[PDB]
Design an enzyme around this catalytic site. Structure first.
Site, PDB file in Angstrom:
ATOM      1  CB  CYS A   1      -1.677   0.063   1.048  1.00 36.17           C
ATOM      2  SG  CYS A   1      -0.419   0.237   2.734  1.00 36.17           S
TER       3      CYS A   1
ATOM      4  NE  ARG B   1      -3.370  -5.053   2.287  1.00 39.97           N
ATOM      5  CZ  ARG B   1      -2.893  -4.334   0.542  1.00 39.97           C
ATOM      6  NH1 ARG B   1      -3.016  -3.074   0.389  1.00 39.97           N
ATOM      7  NH2 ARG B   1      -2.807  -5.222  -0.080  1.00 39.97           N
TER       8      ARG B   1
ATOM      9  CB  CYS C   1       0.020  -2.072   6.600  1.00 36.86           C
ATOM     10  SG  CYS C   1      -0.076  -0.862   5.711  1.00 36.86           S
TER      11      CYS C   1
END
Ligand code: SF4
Ligand code: SF4
Ligand code: SF4
Ligand code: SF4
Ligand code: FCO
Ligand code: FCO
Ligand code: F3S
Ligand code: F3S
Ligand SMILES: [Mg+2]
Ligand SMILES: [Mg+2]
Ligand code: NI
Ligand code: NI
Lengths: 551, 267, 267, 551
Positions: A63, A478, A548
């Site tokens: 990401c 996400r 993340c």
């Protein structure tokens, strides 16, 4: 009765361990564990607010873009900066193109091998495989000839004896339900997906300066210099080049990814009745289009106890109801301070003590919204859009349902979306809707430049005294992402990231309530405890990202 | 038979693997099907858990002395390596074991090459470079955050096609990619020479593509090929060309240490 | 409806049309199906002879005041126009006729922009530029031999999208493409500055990518975008990057006049 | 009889007029006329020999590269320079990749609309069209879905009312014989061809510095700096990139172009019995691979009166028999000096006096070989390779014949190759064999660099006094090319280009003998003298290039 551990979980980003108790062949209890920490929040502390985004973007390279954008939004929030609209268009194009790459790779490179048996594809008849897609897709690359070429690649790899990353996969497992032909179709699409995602990243690169890790942002806007008549800058030729890549994305997304999604549901309909992670959902609105950090193209909101009819809309990234609800706990995490913390007052003090089933078992914190566990991500974002009555979302979901109807004679209700497959479906719907975001924002950019607005950046000032608190929200691939910056005497005095995989992957919370991953696994049938494919199926549906989750 | 490769991620963000997905020569699909046998890579592997650790052990044995080991991310040594644990063991142990039988060892990215962002600031986890973990081994460093993937792929190709690594500099970086300062091969050098500088993003000079030195460009102190090879193979795409200064992400002591707008030293 | 274009070739080598076949934004197929209506182009037309001449006359009428006229090649005035005769008439007459109803007029390539190679030396045919034969008209010049096709395509797109030409310099060249000397935006400028020069092809300095000034580079005296936009959209491709000096093909009095190895004047 | 004029002939390079006398619907006599001259031979005179290639490359931008390569070969010949083998590999790659682009574009963009009726494609059934190709091609882009998309593109264009380059085409002409389905397949392939030729030119660009008009040659070798370890030069990364494009060409060439060539012959078999232009053929060997300007990968030779068994091999570009046989006349051309001239003694003195059927009517000179008219180009080059017993050529022709035989039940004999379709077949065979040249020469380059040879350039010396003569031969896409340079006191004192379309399109010669275009047209049936499609079909089979023919 037995205890299994899945370590490493592969085909995710980062380092994850999943533990499960199995009783009578069904998972009865699960633990999710992020097993790597870097301390990115501490690394960025005491620096100039303007520098944070380049550092914290490195929370994640899957990401990429997301933490850069959330960081500049957080500094802009602290500082009361309104971003120029051209900078919003550019940020939006980047985020939408990135997310296109991200979701395609998730469905194919990361998730397909849970559902698809490559050995079985060797038994397929390519002509029958192609014949199965007549009236189902208009994609131009579903011929028997394409499929034969793909089957020969698989043959050659198997023939070489070097299966590498395809080795020791779950071939012949009883939970593999696709016919040979469908397995072959999936492998062909897996390879085709790689071309599409590359095109999506060419969009990102032309505005970002490269990807992974874009380099065109600033607290105050963007670094792209708009000048249609300028040599070496963002001119009409460069804009045309961007557009040429935007236009290459839609056909694959609509005619392969969207259709495959309906098809996997049709063959695996039991997976609509399992993998529910939560009864509460959160998303933030995304793609601002005005001069004041608002007028989002996508809506946000909060759903409590699966009730779409009484959801709460969120239309602003400055919404105090959203801001005040968010806390994180480290009771069952490897940090010292355990009571729920609002992120402006958050600490991240490591306190590793090894694994304990009833104590600390993860570097992932446990986030809550007004004391409740919440699922974030594409299932949340689709359910919120449906709650909002967004016609584009309804219509796109209805297309997937119509394909499912045609194949099965059955329909799909909203109740069935609270599931492993529903999660997958929300992701596909998001990818589809993102192609209109790209067309819309490219057009808005061209139109605005034509009105004579070339503004991209407003230089900030940062008072050398005072304490200022800012939060940057972003609807990431996400789910809802937030970066929380406190500035004191001109420097970052606190920085806390609450990331979407933190919400989903986080361990049991201050009240020992179970997070979405851990909840979702209860009741999973596991045919072979040594090869727990079914567990991985559900965990992959959340698109874990552990760099993340932990940072 | 294809040359075997074992890829282990330590304190990685995955951006170094993700660089491969932008590659065109070879594409990632041609890499894995034609150029190499990717024997272990957690991001793409069908197998998980016990099955994937079996793959790794089998491959380390079968290809002893033959495989290229690739590591992304920093390796955390603080508190006995517990800041990165895979299959219940410190990643430093997985890396040293795999290093024993490697034909060649590559640190892909600034994190594994010199510690990178993960080692910056106070270095909460005592993150260090791959070369620091493997003192008796020659580690080829391919820095960048992440590098253009072909800085890696052409290094691997040189090993495969000609049987030895490419020529390396004093930091064990391939000279074809890292042999020269960015500022010693930057197309905006004429503007630098003339005193033509952008002062703020969006100003008139910035909108004419002038030099980014006074915005904080670290090209004068960063070795790399970002101005020539650039990124993504579309033509014209690198940070400076897009309008933003180099941050020095390739170069230890520059990227993640100096502020974006802090001025570089010029030789 | 798509904006109409009439393309007439005079003393052309067809390289300027061929440039379109390398284009990517738009590709030539998208240009002709989506972006414009190419009403006359002899290289690609299904019709020939009397049928294609009828097409031209019909388009000139139907789209009077609306079409872009494009000319490649020089126009030969010697001996009353007979060095280029199409359908039994001097090409200068075809061009003047078509110019009467044009909304915009573009000289694609050095030949039409300033006479180019066809007007060099003794100038056997009295070849001249498009502007010379259309004194009452503003001709947009897109020089190069041939230009990057997007220098043309983005000029056309500006006319279509924003309703006027792009900003032009005092030679009526679009500033986004011709606004700066190659040498004032060349990545080998640092080498020039340091006295690091290739002296012969294949020598040590040439093999390190050093400046090509002493091989005859005309970058110091040629306006263009060859070092930035480059060619073919693959990245890194222009003459100097490949290892050969700029010849000055964009620039009147440079290309086709000065020898390859003759030194440029530096400002 | 009736007299017609076709002016301009379109879908060629340059400016061509064709006149025909037609007796009872059959062409009895024809005239070919190049209608544009530049005097490129005079423009390049009185310059340094080193500069010629950059100037004379601009003879043509369709056959870009070719005049550049012939010019440097001619100066090298005059100076007695042996080109470094790495320089040969690089020149070879460029020429082969260029010629791949050139031939693909000739078959599809330039020629297909002589044989293909787009209107008829609107009536096609895409599914039936796809089914016709089962067992005939393995190409991956022959699905009904591809074909439907293409059909809709045609439909959308027609419905716009702006047909542009497709307007006033020969739709429904009685000589159009393809069924609707095959028309639709050909349009799909026409569009696919554009992708393939773009990839071919990416090869050319990465070595040439751009295309059109490469910029990497020198008298003495090439300007590419070979250094696998060098930044900004021709290193292994750049070579890998070149290879990535070389690898993309073969499938379209073999599975589409090669197949379409057989199929066109199957539907138009009468075109195997007309369009014979000559009884004598010439080609030069090409693709040198040693350090002495020889060891060619393709053979050359001279065929007289169609007798392959008695042909004369040509294995050297210094062959005195070849050199001494070549002359050109301007008896029926617009130049002053009319007796046949050897090109080292050639003049090009303009003498325009308008069109005369029996006098001067063209800017093209009339070349002869020992006093005979000769056809050059892919028919010649194929027939020479067959005479030489080159198995690769034999085998590739046999593949085309096999497809033709599958469709028709008939074989093809060598006699049938002396024709309009034979000429097209020769071109296709050449394009197919060129893919192996590309692989061979890329591998040769990588291998040679590996041995430690990075040499690319031998700096010339040019005596400041003396007169000396050189000739550079090249087998161009359209046939044998030669550039003839005389150097006197260090500068070019004469320069003569004898170009392949000069051989084929030249007018009646000093003995009033008819050249290939003009001869080929005798016997052509013309159903509609207002719309002489049959004439253009034959003329296009020679791939006219008039900037080349005339210069
Ligand atoms: S070098 Fe950069 S992209 Fe690679 S692992 Fe480290 S932070 Fe991520
Ligand atoms: S300071 Fe940066 S932008 Fe300026 S010339 Fe140097 S490397 Fe280029
Ligand atoms: S400008 Fe160059 S490429 Fe264009 S017609 Fe003239 S010679 Fe040919
Ligand atoms: S002389 Fe040529 S190569 Fe050298 S810096 Fe100037 S433009 Fe670049
Ligand atoms: N998407 C994403 Fe990464 C996670 N989880 C962020 O934010
Ligand atoms: N091919 C080509 Fe051009 C012609 N005729 C040359 O040489
Ligand atoms: S920040 Fe990094 S990617 Fe290149 S431009 Fe500077 S070394
Ligand atoms: S010769 Fe021409 S193409 Fe550019 S590099 Fe020089 S202006
Ligand atoms: Mg956090
Ligand atoms: Mg001549
Ligand atoms: Ni992530
Ligand atoms: Ni030509």
């Amino acid at each position: 009765s037995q205890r299994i551990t899945i370590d490493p979980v592969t085909r995710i980003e980062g380092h994850l361990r999943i533990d499960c108790e199995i009783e009578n062949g069904v998972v009865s209890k699960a633990w999710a564990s992020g097993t790597m920490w870097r301390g990115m929040e501490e690394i960025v502390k005491n620096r100039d607010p303007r520098d944070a985004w380049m550092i914290v973007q490195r929370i994640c390279g899957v990401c990429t873009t997301t933490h850069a954008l959330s960081s500049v939004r957080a500094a802009e929030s602290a500082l009361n900066i309104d971003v120029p609209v051209n900078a919003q268009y550019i940020r939006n194009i980047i985020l939408a193109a990135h997310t296109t790459h991200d979701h395609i790779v998730h469905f194919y490179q990361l998730s397909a091998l849970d559902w698809v048996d490559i050995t079985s594809a060797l038994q397929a008849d390519p002509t029958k495989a192609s014949e199965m897609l007549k009236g189902v897709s208009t994609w131009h690359l579903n011929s028997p000839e394409e499929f034969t070429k793909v089957q020969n690649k698989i043959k050659d790899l198997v023939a070489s004896g070097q299966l590498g990353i395809f080795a020791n996969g779950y071939w012949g497992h009883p939970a593999m339900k696709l016919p040979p032909e469908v397995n072959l179709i999936a492998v062909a699409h897996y390879l085709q997906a790689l071309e599409c995602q590359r095109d999506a990243n060419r969009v990102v690169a032309l505005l970002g300066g490269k990807t992974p890790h874009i380099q065109n942002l600033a607290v105050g806007g963007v670094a792209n210099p708009i000048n249609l008549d300028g040599l070496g800058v963002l001119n009409l030729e460069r804009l045309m080049y961007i557009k040429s890549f935007i236009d290459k994305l839609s056909d694959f997304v609509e005619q392969v990814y969207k259709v495959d999604t309906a098809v996997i549901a049709a063959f695996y309909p039991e997976w609509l009745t399992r993998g529910k992670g939560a009864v509460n959902y959160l998303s933030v609105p995304e793609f601002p289009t005005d001069s004041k950090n608002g007028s989002f193209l996508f809506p946000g909101g909060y759903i409590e106890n699966a009730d779409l009819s009484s959801y709460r809309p969120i239309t602003s990234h400055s919404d105090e109801y959203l801001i005040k609800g968010i806390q994180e706990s480290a009771k069952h995490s490897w940090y010292k301070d355990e009571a729920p913390q609002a992120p402006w007052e958050g600490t991240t003090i490591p306190a590793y003590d090894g694994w304990s089933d009833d104590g600390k078992y993860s570097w992932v914190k446990s986030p809550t919204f007004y004391g409740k566990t919440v699922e974030v991500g594409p299932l949340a974002n689709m359910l919120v859009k449906l709650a909002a009555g967004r016609e584009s979302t309804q219509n796109k979901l209805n297309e997937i349902v119509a394909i499912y109807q045609k194949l099965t004679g059955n329909t799909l209700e909203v109740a069935q979306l609270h599931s492993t497959l529903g999660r997958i479906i929300g992701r596909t719907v998001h990818c589809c809707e993102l192609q209109d975001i790209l067309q819309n924002q490219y057009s808005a950019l061209i139109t605005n430049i034509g009105k004579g607005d070339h503004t991209t950046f407003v230089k900030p000032n940062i008072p050398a005294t005072g304490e200022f608190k800012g939060v940057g929200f972003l609807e990431a691939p996400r789910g809802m992402l937030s970066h929380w910056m406190v500035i004191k005497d001109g420097i970052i005095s606190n920085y806390q990231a609450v990331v979407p995989s933190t919400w989903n992957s986080g361990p049991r919370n201050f009240n020992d309530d179970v997070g979405p991953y851990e909840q979702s696994l209860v009741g999973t049938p596991v045919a072979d405890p040594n090869k727990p494919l079914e567990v991985v199926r559900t965990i992959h549906s959340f698109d874990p990202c552990m760099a993340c989750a932990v940072h | 038979q294809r040359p075997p490769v074992i890829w282990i991620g330590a304190q990685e963000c995955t951006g170094c693997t993700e660089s491969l997905l932008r590659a065109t020569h070879p594409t990632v699909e041609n890499l894995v099907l034609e150029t190499i046998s990717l024997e272990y890579h957690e991001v793409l592997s069908a197998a998980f858990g016990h099955q994937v650790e079996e793959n790794k052990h089998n491959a380390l044995e079968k290809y002893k002395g033959q495989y290229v080991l690739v590591v992304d991310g920093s390796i955390p040594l603080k508190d006995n390596g517990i800041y990165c644990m895979v299959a219940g063991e410190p990643i430093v142990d997985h890396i040293r074991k795999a290093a024993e039988g490697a034909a060649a060892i590559i640190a892909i990215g600034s994190c594994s090459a010199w510690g990178g962002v993960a080692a910056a600031g106070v270095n909460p986890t005592g993150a260090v470079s791959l070369q620091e973990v493997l003192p008796g081994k020659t580690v080829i460093n391919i820095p960048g955050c992440p590098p253009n993937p072909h800085n890696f792929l052409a290094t691997v190709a040189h090993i495969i096609t000609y049987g030895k690594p490419p020529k390396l500099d004093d930091k064990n970086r391939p000279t074809f990619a890292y042999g020269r300062l960015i500022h010693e091969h930057c197309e905006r050098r004429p503007h630098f020479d003339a005193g033509r500088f952008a002062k703020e993003f969006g100003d008139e000079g910035h909108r004419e593509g002038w030099c980014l030195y006074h915005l904080g460009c670290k090209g004068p102190e960063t070795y790399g090929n970002c101005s020539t090879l650039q990124f993504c193979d579309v033509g014209g795409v690198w940070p400076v060309a897009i309008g933003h200064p180099c941050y020095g992400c390739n170069e230890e002591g520059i990227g993640f240490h100096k502020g974006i707008h802090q001025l570089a030293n010029v030789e």
